[PDB]
Write a protein that binds this ligand. Structure first.
Ligand code: HEM
Ligand SMILES: Oc1ccc(CNc2[nH]nc(-c3ccc(O)cc3)c2-c2ccc(O)cc2)cc1
Length: 393
């Protein structure tokens, strides 16, 4: 027989039984990626946390030429160290401050947008597609607002992402085409005097500040493109599959409908059991490092399986159950951990909370309009998502 292949399944509505067997029998073990490369798959909470909190397991070095690869690059290799570059340009604080959900009127904008989308769906009548006509438009509108760019520019940038976040064995020509075009767009945004708010407005000001005279224009455009893409794909995909998790639990749906003050904790649990990341987080060992029973050698590829950690019964008892009163509710790895912890976590949380609150208020009887098995799960993608999410109410 051949070496165990990853990923195991593109389905985001259930965790494979094989994961628990793996965690119990071999919480770090050798696998083969789609490129043919070998890697260590880590699937226990303890070892996942160990790996993510040890910077000698490097994100940046995953971009090195000749390295074993999880998948082909869809960005310039320097972009792999994007946050690092941000840090080096002295821009980390401003960027992070710009993408919090705390800006005046941001949450009200989210609510208004969600409510408008839902009103439109209700007017059009069931069935409704909660991905293409709710979650993703909401994410896109949100990130246009956050970046300070026109709403009407959102869809076209959005249309890069189905390619931008592919997980391919080979390089993707369209990915480079779209990348260069979106980069030209963001550079134009930086030169556009009308853009004075949000992330791009702030970057536009800092660009002309003498304290930043030697930061490259490339980096400025790149922040815009990368944060738009990662933010929209992450919030859209998470919200979609969270809505799936919610729909499959009518009792929770009803409870949250009755006591919306419980919605954030619910969202936190929805975060914990979320399967949106299709692959483990990649890291390259820069030294010989002991992980459980395995001595990982310098230059080897390591994959941190988030659902491995988050469904670990040793950290989250009865892991498959949504429990709103856990003693350790935010200790999941849905936003990663350590050096590369998600800078957009608060915004993602608020996006999901407001989207769910609005949905439950508008569509308290929301349910799937097709049998669960009929959902079409996107393959070889960095996220797990159903192509369409047909619902009734
Ligand atoms: C539910 C929403 C989200 C989830 C579940 C999520 C998940 C994650 C995870 C697991 C990582 C760590 C990846 C790794 O360490 O290899 C990460 C990092 C990152 N996230 Fe998110 N994210 C979300 C929303 C967002 C948003 C809203 C933005 C931006 C507006 C964003 C931008 C980024 C960026 C740029 C990184 C790279 C950090 C680094 O390289 O140090 N994400 N995210
Ligand atoms: O070896 C690797 C390679 C890539 C990655 C991150 N994955 C990723 N795939 N696609 C994009 C992307 C985003 C926007 C866009 O217009 C086109 C493509 C990104 C990305 C890049 C930098 C970030 O800071 C965030 C997300 C991690 C390890």
């Amino acid at each position: 027989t051949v070496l165990l292949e990853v990923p195991f399944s593109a389905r985001g509505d259930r965790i494979p039984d094989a994961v628990a067997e793996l965690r119990t029998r071999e919480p770090i073990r050798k696998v083969r990626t789609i490129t043919g490369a070998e890697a260590w798959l880590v699937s226990s909470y303890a070892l996942c946390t160990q790996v993510l909190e040890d910077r000698r397991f490097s994100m940046k070095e995953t971009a090195a030429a000749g390295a074993p690869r999880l998948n082909a690059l869809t960005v310039p290799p320097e972009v792999v160290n994007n946050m690092g570059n941000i840090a080096d340009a002295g821009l980390r604080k401003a960027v992070m401050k710009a993408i919090t959900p705390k800006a005046p009127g941001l949450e009200q904008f989210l609510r208004d947008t969600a409510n408008s989308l839902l009103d439109n769906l209700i007017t059009e009548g069931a069935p409704a597609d909660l991905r293409n006509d709710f979650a993703d438009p909401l994410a896109t509108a949100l990130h246009c607002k956050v970046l300070g760019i026109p709403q009407e520019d959102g869809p076209k940038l959005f249309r890069s992402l189905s390619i931008a976040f592919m997980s391919s064995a080979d390089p993707i020509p369209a990915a480079k085409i779209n990348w260069d075009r979106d980069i030209e767009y963001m550079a134009g945004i930086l030169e556009n005097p009308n853009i004075t708010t949000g992330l791009m407005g702030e970057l536009s000001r800092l660009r002309k500040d003498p304290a930043y005279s030697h930061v490259s224009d490339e980096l400025f455009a790149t922040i815009g493109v990368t944060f738009f893409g990662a933010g929209v794909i992450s919030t859209g995909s998470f919200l979609t599959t969270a809505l799936i998790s919610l729909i499959q639990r009518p009792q929770l749906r009803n409870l949250l409908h009755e006591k919306p003050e419980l919605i954030p904790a619910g969202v936190e649990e929805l975060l914990r059991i979320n399967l949106s990341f299709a692959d483990g987080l990649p890291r390259l060992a820069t030294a010989d490092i002991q992980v459980g029973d395995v001595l990982v050698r310098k230059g080897e590829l390591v994959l941190v399986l988030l659902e491995g950690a988050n469904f670990d019964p040793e950290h989250f008892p009865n892991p498959g159950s949504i429990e709103l009163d856990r003693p350790n509710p935010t200790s999941h790895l849905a936003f990663g951990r350590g050096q590369h912890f998600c800078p957009g976590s608060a915004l993602g949380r608020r996006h999901a909370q407001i989207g769910i609150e609005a949905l439950l208020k508008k569509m308290p009887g929301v349910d799937l309009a097709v049998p669960i098995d009929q959902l079409v799960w996107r393959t070889r993608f960095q996220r797990r998502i159903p192509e369409r999410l047909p619902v009734l109410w």
